[PDB]
Structures are given as structure tokens and as C-alpha cells.
Amino acid sequence: HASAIESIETIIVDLPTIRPHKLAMHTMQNQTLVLIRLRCADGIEGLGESTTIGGLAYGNESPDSIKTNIDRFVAPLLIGQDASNINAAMLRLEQSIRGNTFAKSGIESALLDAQGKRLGLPVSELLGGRVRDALPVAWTLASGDTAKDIAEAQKMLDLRRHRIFKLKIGAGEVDRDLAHVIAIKKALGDSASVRVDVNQAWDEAVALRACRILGGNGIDLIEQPISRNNRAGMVRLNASSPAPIMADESIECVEDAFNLAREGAASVFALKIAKNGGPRATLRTAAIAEAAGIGLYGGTMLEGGIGTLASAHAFLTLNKLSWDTELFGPLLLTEDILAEPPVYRDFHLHVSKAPGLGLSLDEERLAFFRR
Amino acid sequence: HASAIESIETIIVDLPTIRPHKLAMHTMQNQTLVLIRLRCADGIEGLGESTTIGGLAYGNESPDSIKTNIDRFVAPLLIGQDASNINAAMLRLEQSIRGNTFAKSGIESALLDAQGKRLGLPVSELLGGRVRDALPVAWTLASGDTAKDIAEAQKMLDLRRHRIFKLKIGAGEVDRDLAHVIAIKKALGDSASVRVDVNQAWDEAVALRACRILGGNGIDLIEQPISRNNRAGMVRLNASSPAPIMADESIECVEDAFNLAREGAASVFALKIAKNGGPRATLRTAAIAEAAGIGLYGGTMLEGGIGTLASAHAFLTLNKLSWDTELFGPLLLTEDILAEPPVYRDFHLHVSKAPGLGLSLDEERLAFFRR
Amino acid sequence: HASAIESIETIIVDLPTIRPHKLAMHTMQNQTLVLIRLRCADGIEGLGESTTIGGLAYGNESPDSIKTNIDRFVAPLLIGQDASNINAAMLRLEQSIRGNTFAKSGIESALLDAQGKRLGLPVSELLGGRVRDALPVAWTLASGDTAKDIAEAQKMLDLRRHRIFKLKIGAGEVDRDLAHVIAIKKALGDSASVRVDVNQAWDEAVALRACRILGGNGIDLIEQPISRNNRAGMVRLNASSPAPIMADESIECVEDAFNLAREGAASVFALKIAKNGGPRATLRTAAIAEAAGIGLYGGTMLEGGIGTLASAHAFLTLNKLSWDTELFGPLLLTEDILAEPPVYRDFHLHVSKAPGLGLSLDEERLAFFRR
Amino acid sequence: HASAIESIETIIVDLPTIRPHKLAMHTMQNQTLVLIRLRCADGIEGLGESTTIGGLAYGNESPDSIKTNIDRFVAPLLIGQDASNINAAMLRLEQSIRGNTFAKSGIESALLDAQGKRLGLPVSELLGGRVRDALPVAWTLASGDTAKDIAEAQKMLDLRRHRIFKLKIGAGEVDRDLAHVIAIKKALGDSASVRVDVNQAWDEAVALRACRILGGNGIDLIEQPISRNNRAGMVRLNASSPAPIMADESIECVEDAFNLAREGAASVFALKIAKNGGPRATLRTAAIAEAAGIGLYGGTMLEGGIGTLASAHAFLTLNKLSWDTELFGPLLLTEDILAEPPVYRDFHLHVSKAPGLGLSLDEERLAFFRR
Numbered sequence A, B, C, D: 001h002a003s004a005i006e007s008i009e010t011i012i013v014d015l016p017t018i019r020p021h022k023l024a025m026h027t028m029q030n031q032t033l034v035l036i037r038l039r040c041a042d043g044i045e046g047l048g049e050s051t052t053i054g055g056l057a058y059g060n061e062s063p064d065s066i067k068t069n070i071d072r073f074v075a076p077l078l079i080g081q082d083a084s085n086i087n088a089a090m091l092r093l094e095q096s097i098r099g100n101t102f103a104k105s106g107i108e109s110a111l112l113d114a115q116g117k118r119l120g121l122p123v124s125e126l127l128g129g130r131v132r133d134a135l136p137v138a139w140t141l142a143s144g145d146t147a148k149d150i151a152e153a154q155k156m157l158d159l160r161r162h163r164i165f166k167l168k169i170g171a172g173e174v175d176r177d178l179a180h181v182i183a184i185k186k187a188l189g190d191s192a193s194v195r196v197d198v199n200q201a202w203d204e205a206v207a208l209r210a211c212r213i214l215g216g217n218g219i220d221l222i223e224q225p226i227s228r229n230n231r232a233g234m235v236r237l238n239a240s241s242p243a244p245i246m247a248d249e250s251i252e253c254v255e256d257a258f259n260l261a262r263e264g265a266a267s268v269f270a271l272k273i274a275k276n277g278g279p280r281a282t283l284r285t286a287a288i289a290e291a292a293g294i295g296l297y298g299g300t301m302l303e304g305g306i307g308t309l310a311s312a313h314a315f316l317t318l319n320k321l322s323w324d325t326e327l328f329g330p331l332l333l334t335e336d337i338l339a340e341p342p343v344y345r346d347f348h349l350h351v352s353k354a355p356g357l358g359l360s361l362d363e364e365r366l367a368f369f370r371r
């Protein structure tokens, strides 16, 4: 085919971050991305990104294993295939490859980028058409210090950078974590929306009490308070919690979205291209949530500009994202591999109408930071 | 915008059929279509079709009211809008217009046709990319006579036209309808798949027995045996019936698909663009079904070539249609408004790769049959 | 520590098989194992095995990615740790590594082997004590030809090798697969137990009928007929099926076992060390099943002698394995890396009381077949 | 066998306590233990303990009937059996003896002690390996006087003996018991965790109100508020109670643990070797709880040092005991039969790495207190 895939190169890139990022299960000291360079017979190159958090501390795919599986199994299946038929290409992978959603997400992102350049259309238009040009972007406070977090949030407000804050908790004693969250919301008052993410850290026995306290203290959303494995517990917590509960880790594929909606495990779903298998699969998960009356949140696995924009282009097509987005990955990185970073201003991420993902590689940064 | 919608004309067309088509609630003596001609500033015209069965005997929208609502409410909302952004256009309609899925389906079909011509791509590619070029097509036997039906099916087999037969029942006494179906399957044996559609005609009290008899006599699928209103009954029948049950009328929007899947009301879903609001909405319903492990069937409201191809292009992108399709509408019509009819041969409908819906109007037929 | 782990080497070994093995999603032409060589400060070496089927066609871990993740993440965490405290070592991995059960299984197997040699006890005794010395072993028929399968089963009976047969179906047309299974059971009659494994291939719409037919034709067990994602469907099938349903792919961790038991998704559970994270985790899954009144089956991912014996030693401690085992992996391989193969005779696998896994490496075979 | 069991002697020992211990159904004025002395052919003696509370006021086994059933049924089954294969020995008992979990617990404890001495390993290592050397120990306040309880708790805090307090209620008027608990928590404030145990005393009609009041007054956990027989009620209370509910009496075997988890009867499970049938069975119950996302608590039936250490060794292997333990039995006894008592300091019980249960009998105390 004139648009046959000729090569797929995966590159692991280690990039510095602006500060330690403390999650319940892991403390980030930097970030590692897997860049995908997909080249086609018509001379077009598509760029994609597969990124996770903390090696294997978050999910079963590491940047290392993502490269291994793409090089050994994905490339052989796609090289020679028509790059202009994305649905057929991704279904070809689906029939021979189980799981590996992070790898698939990066691959589809690259195909979409190339197809966008091929047709001279931004990805958002390839996916149906945008209904907005900007997306609201929350900011995560996870320094591990209450005083530092409050100061940081106040500055982001003054800079008109962020007005929605996500607090990482679950690593310490429940009451200390609760006091921490309450103190932050008290300091910010009505000037900002404060939410929390427990990253599955709590047992239902703890969550049933903690959610009541948070809801009674101005916390707007409680993300994945308990293990995705306590299916019945998540359903019960949705009933006892006065604050809405959002599912994140509970979604590891489109089918999980349906089952969670069927069971009533959460009233809001985080949408992550890495967890669903790319922008298109993520839109199917969004369709399921919408059909069930479940709110949407534009999630991230802390991707750099490529993965962030791939996510953004899909979100631009959604009717509504009631709970906004957390597409701040590029801002946590002190250095990224894009020639021009995404545009952030006035509490939003602004997406252009340039072809594909509307970005280009910074060859110097790639050369220095690639492993 | 360069692709602004300049006009939308709705035309009611009354066309002759090859023979009376007897459904449980109505007997068709002909067919009426609503043609949509959408013209854009860049000189491109998109064609769409909104068609139903028996006036108001099947659904709440008649060809007459579809024209009324499109002319009075849809056109005012779309004229002047960018035709190249289909998602924004359909969402604009969704925010101001409740229901009217048949009208919406015709409108989106026209927009897709125009966009396909605009980019020089068939609709199937606009929707992501085809994974097949042909679709298996079933045939409905509904003459009202057992001997006639058997003869007709045998001929369709000999002509290599159809090998899957759908039998319309529910208008007569249950046992007489059952004998009718059993006699047909007995005569055809393993040379064909025989299924039935009761069009909601039976009460659960009757269906619980009838489904057992049909399943025990070689009937492969039982379509909408009871009222969509007996929600609990459909769930119970899925358990007592040895033959799979398919939901059709139970789906009147994407959200219904989710609720039916949540409740376990059917193991197979019929996919109709008219019932969901167009090809794109139908793909969302398909995504929900797939995520729930529910089989897919390419349904029809007996549309002519335009509506049939709009449906076909969407179905070409589905990973699998386990229960095939019933896209035979153009074959039931003795006359259609296409210059070249869809290609049917060797038990399938063959879809080309021509731009848009790959069709053109027969001006002479349109002029003579338009109301 | 005196028993500190000094090194962990992972070796990918490609071995020939006796014949093509056709599963619903993949056709095996050979087999690849990941050998784990764990050496301790006290001069003891423990051997473990992490093996899967068809690259990524079966699960999300490939032999390639298993090596990548063990070398990059597991080794760093364990080197220097006390090898004699297996629970602490495996929990150390669990707190930093998500998923990767296949890798974990191989690691724990190696630790158990080393600990057995260290104490001069077979693994079965380290795990509590055996209650049997032999395990019944089924045989899978998957040549893709009915005549060939019947002949093969008859020979295994005559050789007193196997009397329980597992038939792989789901790749072809349902009725053809059903005829295939029925013909085999008809030919063998009461001389053997015939079961099937659909490897998630069927939709519930198909399974609800197929299970009835199989149960009515002498088929003793139906393994994973539908997708693990159709949670509600598996529960419904357990009620409509006259033949017991066994969960396999539905179990990807110990927690899944609990949820399946809670929901009533299957009446029998396959026990696979690779799917649970090693012999010890598998015994926890067995404990859950037993507590729920669910039958046990000793499963396999087609491991060679090392993985097969690691599985066997755990199964020797179970009170009862009502549905026997399928520990025939070493028999499907024309060549393995053990100096002395496991002992198979009179329909059983016979496990010795030698220290650890009671095996040693064949250096010549390892050298020739290692990648 | 070289390690054949040659004799099993059961000895009832009546020991003085430090003060009356008032439970909802009984007031303890002393404590009675059943010591098990199991001697093997290799000259090794294993010690075990089967102890309950208040004769038959708590459970169906009394110290008297435990001795009767062990002497008449257990001994005959085990004498002559290989003591080094604990799993086979306990399964041999399970196939011929129904219930009698207290007796079984003492027997397995003795076998583990002997096996530990045989291999020169502490029981915790026989069970897989410890992940901690110390266990947090709560203290029960049950003098029947509010002023006395507050003073006692304050002293235990000052002595760095205990900082978690369990209050026995249910014997008096609900409001008086509630005032009692609230006054104690008020006096201790944040310096201690206060929990209650109602020992099944309340009717659901009372519990639904009382749990709300306790949860709203700083009470951290509510143990078995109602009858284990009101299965549906326990499930309902888990939803209405703002404080987590723990199941104790509801667990009388491993299977009960599964059923309670399936039904959602409690969010925390008390782990008692006497109620499950020994350390090993208790670890299976813990595995079920963990798989269900249910918190763990190290429970006691007020055993002396032998039974307390048997429990402790098992708990040392658990990944996490979110709700700590109540292994204070030896502290309630003014006299025990151990030559050296367990080590309690700085809010914890410290377990050594000595072989077996790491203890020896005080021949003088045994001689004087044995019945």
C-alpha cells in the first residue's frame, strides 16, 4: 500500500521532573517515556507515547516491557500494513495481543498523528470533530508537606494556571492524611475545587468513615479510595459516601467500564488512553459512561506532550467533561521532547488545529535524554 | 465557513414494493422514504435517508412528521453551520432536539456522505476504516402463507441470494404461527439459518412456552418476543429460552442499549441507525454491546439504497457481526431512487470504496415518485 | 544473610513440540520457556519456570517481557535478600510490582526449589505435607481433525497414559465444533471422561445453546465458554448449563477467585501457578474455592518439567482435586531441559520425595535450545 | 515412622486471673486451659493449648469436653501417624471429626511446636516466614466500672503497655453502656484508639441506633454488635453504621469467613485459631478476607502463653493486620504454665526466633494448677 508502515522505533527517554511527586504507593523522582516513531511509505512519520508511573509500581507494563513487547510482537504485525486504516490495524493487534493497553495506546497515537498529517487535519477532527478548543486542567499537590502544598496551590491560582487541585493521600495514617486535606481546603476556601486520590490505598473499613469526613469538609471528589478488587465494596461506598467516587485503577479496559457501570461502582470515570488502549478505545469507554449517566474526567498517566495531546484531541470531541481534566503531565516535566510545548494559560490547555497532534520533536533533547 | 450548510431539503418519496410484507402489527403494501438533500457552500451535496414502517404503526415518527420536524427545527439549527464538523453539528441538534432519532439519522447520513465526497473517502473510512468489503444479508419471509414462504426461500438459496431467513410472526394464533415456523425450518433443514421476529406481539405468558418450542425445533434466534415495556419479563425469558433472544424495539436510543445490557434483557442487539440517531450513534450502541459480550446484528427499518448503505458503511467497521445483517431493504423495493443499486451477490451486499456513500440520485425516479 | 540471593538469571528457551496444538485463538508450533536460575550465598541454586502460550496471544506477559521485567525490576529487589524467607521475599515483590504473575510464579518456584534443597525436603513438604504421591493427568486433543483425535485418545488409553480428554474448541463454526466433540465422546464411550475448553471464544448467545447440547451428549465439563469480561453472563450460564462450567481465564489473581465465587460465576476453578503468582498464591486461591464449595482442577500453561513439578508439589497438598489435573506439559514437548523427565504411568504423574522440585538441568539441552 | 506420634496427653489447668473480666454473657473470675502434650518417636515433645471462655457460656466446647473428645477420638486417630506431616495429620482428623475447632487448634499448635523443634525453626518460619518481629497488642477494659476502666487505661498508656482499648458492653441498658463508652473515649481523647465488643448482645433494632451514636463519638470499631444468626441484619448494619463492624462469633469455621465476605456482613474479620481449627486454618480465613478487601484483626479466646504464641507466629506472616491484635491473654492471667512469659513492651508483643513456639513448661506451676 502507498501508506504501508515501513518501520516502528521505540525509544525509552528518561526525563527530569520539577519536584518529587509522592503517590500512595510510589514517590516519583523523575519520569520515563516510551516514544514511538512510526514511519510510512508515503514519507510520513507519526509520533506516539506510552508512559506509566514508577516502573511496575503502578501497572503491569513498565517502559522497559512496553519496548520489548512492541519490538517483538507489535512491529512484526504492523510493518507492511496500510497505516491509513487505523481501525483495521488496531483490530489486527487486538486479535493477536492480549492486554498491553499502554503499548497499544502509543501505537494508535502514532497512527493518528500520521493520519492527521496525511489528511492535513488535527486528530480531534479525525475523531469526529472538536466542540471546544480548550480543556480545564487540574493540578496535583503531592509534595508530602501541608504547608508546601498550600503555598503551591495559592501560587498556581495567582498565576491563573490552575484552580482545581488533586491531593494524593493514602501513604500515611488516615487521620493525618485527612487533616492534611481538610487544612488545604480550609486555606483555599471557595477559590478552588479540592479533590483527593487514594490510589486504592484504603480498606473499605477505613474508607466508609474517611469518605464521610471528606464529604463533610468540602472535598468535591474521591478518586479510587479502595482496591479495584473489592468490587462489592466500591458499590457500597458509592451509597454511603456523601461525596462522589471516581473509578480510575478499576478501569483497565473498555469492558471494565461497562461492568463498573452495570454494578454501580462509581459515579464518575477517569478516562486514560493508556488504560483503555488509545484515544479511540477511550472514546468507547466514554460512550459507555455517558450512556450510564456517569460523569467524565480527562485522566493522565503523567505523559509528556505527545501523550497529553493525544489524550486532549480525544477529549475535545466529548459533549461534556463534567469533572474537567488533569492533563498537566508536560508541566511536571522540567524537560520534554517537543520542539514547542503545549499551551497552558488561564486554567486551561489550548489545543491548536495543526495537522495530527500538531507537534514536532526536539532532536537535541531526544538525543540527550534517550536511553 | 467554506463548508457551511446552505440548504436542507426533505422529500417524501412513495415507492412500490415487490409484494405485501406482513408484520405482526402492520401489512406493508408499499414503502415511503424521506430523502434529505444537504447542500454546502463548497458545492458539495450530501444525501441521507429517514425511513420507517407503516406510518405510525411501528414508531412515533412518520415520514410526514419527520419532514415537518426537520424543516421546522433541524434546518434552522444547521443552516450556516460548518458541515465538515459532524460531531459538533449533531451535538448542536442533540442539545435542542429530544428524540426524533429517525430524522437525526437521515441528517447525519447526509453529512457523512458530503464529508466523504469532500475528502474523497468512503464513509466507512471516515468512521475509522473497514475490516471487510461485504456483509452477509438475511431475507425476511412474510407473505402470510407457509407454502409461498418455503418456495421463496428455496429460490433465494438457488440464486445464491440469501441463506439466512427471518420469519415474521405474532399476528396469528401462537400455535399456528409456531407450526408455520417449524414447517419452514423442516423444509430447509441445514441449508439455511431460520430465525423469527415477533415484533413485541407476545405476552410473557405465551413467550415462555413458545420460545422453548422454537428453540427445540432448530430456530436460531428469537427477535423481540414481547413488549419492550415488560423489562423484567425480557430478563426472565433470556433465562428460560434455550434460543438466544435479540432486542430490537427495546432499543430506541443509545442509553437503552446500556440499560438492556445492565439488566440482561437480551444476548444479541439489533443495530439500526434510525433507532439510535445515525451511523455514529449506532457505533456507540455497538460499543456498549461488545463491552457487555452481547452479539451484534446489522438491522434495518427497510430503508432504500441510501439508508442501507449508510448502515452498511458503519457495519463494515465492526470487529464482528456474529448474527449477520438484514440489509435487504433495496431488494424489497421494486423501485428505488439510486442511479445504480447496491450490489448483492453470493449471499452478501458488496460495498465499494467510492467517496461518501458511493451513490447518486436517479433524477427521473425521484421526479416521478416524490410526493 | 547466609542464604542471601546473589544472582538471578533468566534464560529464554525455545523447544520443539510433538505436534501442532490448536487453541481457539492460536496454533502452537513449538513452545518457549523462561528458565530462572536463582543462586544463593550458601551455594544453593534454585530453578524456576515462567511459561505462557503463543507470545501475547494468551496473556499479557510474553516470554520476552517476563525476562525484561525480572531482569530490570525483580532482580534488583531480591539480590541481597534472605532467600530462606520466601513469604517476605514474595511480599517485597508484591509491594513494588503490580501484576506480572507469570514472572512471580517462576521466581517463587525457584525460591521453593532452593529452600527444599536447603532443608532437604521436597517442596510439597515445605508447603505443609503431601496427602498423595500421584496426580491424575488429562490429555488435550487439539490436532484440528476429528479422526486424528479419536485415534490419539484410543492409543493413550491403550498405553494407560490418559483416560481424561480435554478438547479445544471455539475456532470454528459452533455446530461443526459441537459435532466434533460429540463424535469423540461417542467413539470413546464410558472408557474416558471427555471435557471441552472454549478459551473464551463463544458469545453468551451461542454458549447458552451449546452448553445444553454438550451436557446432553456426555460432556463432563465446559471450561471458560465465554469472555471473562461477561461477568453477568458467566453467572447466568452456570444456571442454564446442565454441565458444570469451569473458570480459567477468569482467574488472573487470587482476588478474582474470590469475586468469581461471590458472584457464582463457575462451579469449578482451574488452578494455575502462572495465573496466581506461584504455588503459594495458588494454594490461597484453592482455599477460597474450597471454602465456597467450588471444585478444583490442577491447571497448566503448558510448562516444562520445572513448572509442572512446581505445580504438582502444591497440588499434592490439596485435600481433593475433584476434577483431576492437566499436568501434561512435559509430554507435549519433544525436548525439555531436565536431566530426568517427570514420571508418567498408569494415568498419573508420580512425584518423588527428593529435595526441592527433585530435578536437575540437562546442560546439553539448555545450551542448545537457549536463545 | 521415625517421627511417629507416640502419645497425646490433655491436661486441664485452672489458673487465677488478675481481676474479674465482665463480658455481656459471662463474668470471668479465673481461666481454664487445656494443655496438650504431644510426644513423638524421635523424642520431641510439642505443646499446644485449647482454651475457651466461661465453660459453655461462649462456645459449644468446654475445657472438659475438649479433653473428652481429644482423648476418645483424636488420640486414636493420630497415635502412630507421622508427626512431621502436619497437613496429612490435620486432614485425617477433618475427615472423621466434625467441628471441635478448639480441640483441633490445640492439636495443630502442638504439632507445629514439635515440627519447629524438629527442624530448628520457629513456627512463623514453618508457616512461610515472618515479615515482622512484633505485634501491636490492645487491652480490654471490662471491670464493670467507668471510673476504674479510665484509670486502668491511663496507667497502661503511662507504662507504654497498651494504647488500643477494647470495651466490653451489652450486659446493661444500651444508653448506660453507650454513656460508659463515650466517657472513656472522652477521657482518653486522641491518646488511644477505643473500640467496643458487644458479643452479639444487641438486637438489630437497638444496634442500628447505637452504632450511629458510637461512630459519631470517636469509637473506631464495633465488634459483633448482633447475633451471628441475623445474617441479613449484619449486612444492613454494615451500611447504616458510620463505624466499621467486625465479625467474631460469626466466624466458626473457614467457610463462614467466605460466606460473610460474600454477603458483606462485616468489613473487618477477627482471626482466632480456636474458631478456625488452628494456625493454618486461620491463615486460610485470612487469605479469604484479604482477597475480599476485608481488614484483619489478631483475635484471642484469652489463651495463655502457648495459645497466644501459636496465634502470634501465624500473625507474623500476614502482610498486614490493619486493626492490630488483642493477644493479651497471658497478661490477664496472674499465673501461666510457661517457664518464661511472652515479652510485652512498648505497646507490642515481641516474638523470638527460638525453635517451635519458643517456650518451655514450668513444671511447678503445671503440677500445682493442673486439675
Ligand SMILES: O=C(O)C[C@H]1C=CC(=O)O1
Pocket (backbone or CB within 6 Å): A053, A140, A197, A199, A248, A300, A301, A302, A326
Ligand atoms: O492519579 C493517578 O493514578 C495517575 C496520575 C494522574 C495524576 C497524577 O498525579 O498521577
Ligand SMILES: O=C(O)C[C@H]1C=CC(=O)O1
Pocket (backbone or CB within 6 Å): B053, B140, B197, B199, B248, B300, B301, B302, B326
Ligand atoms: O423487523 C423489524 O422490526 C423491521 C424490519 C426489518 C426487516 C423487516 O422485515 O422489517
Ligand SMILES: O=C(O)C[C@H]1C=CC(=O)O1
Pocket (backbone or CB within 6 Å): C053, C140, C197, C199, C248, C300, C301, C302, C326
Ligand atoms: O487450556 C488452556 O487455557 C491452557 C493450556 C492447558 C492445557 C492446554 O492444552 O492449554
Ligand SMILES: O=C(O)C[C@H]1C=CC(=O)O1
Pocket (backbone or CB within 6 Å): D053, D140, D197, D199, D248, D300, D301, D302, D326
Ligand atoms: O472478645 C471476645 O469475644 C473473646 C476475648 C477477646 C478478648 C476478650 O476480652 O475476650
Ligand SMILES: [Mg+2]
Pocket (backbone or CB within 6 Å): A197, A199, A223, A224, A248, A249
Ligand atoms: Mg488515580
Ligand SMILES: [Mg+2]
Pocket (backbone or CB within 6 Å): B197, B199, B223, B224, B248, B249
Ligand atoms: Mg424487529
Ligand SMILES: [Mg+2]
Pocket (backbone or CB within 6 Å): C197, C199, C223, C224, C248, C249
Ligand atoms: Mg483454558
Ligand SMILES: [Mg+2]
Pocket (backbone or CB within 6 Å): D197, D199, D223, D224, D248, D249
Ligand atoms: Mg468478640
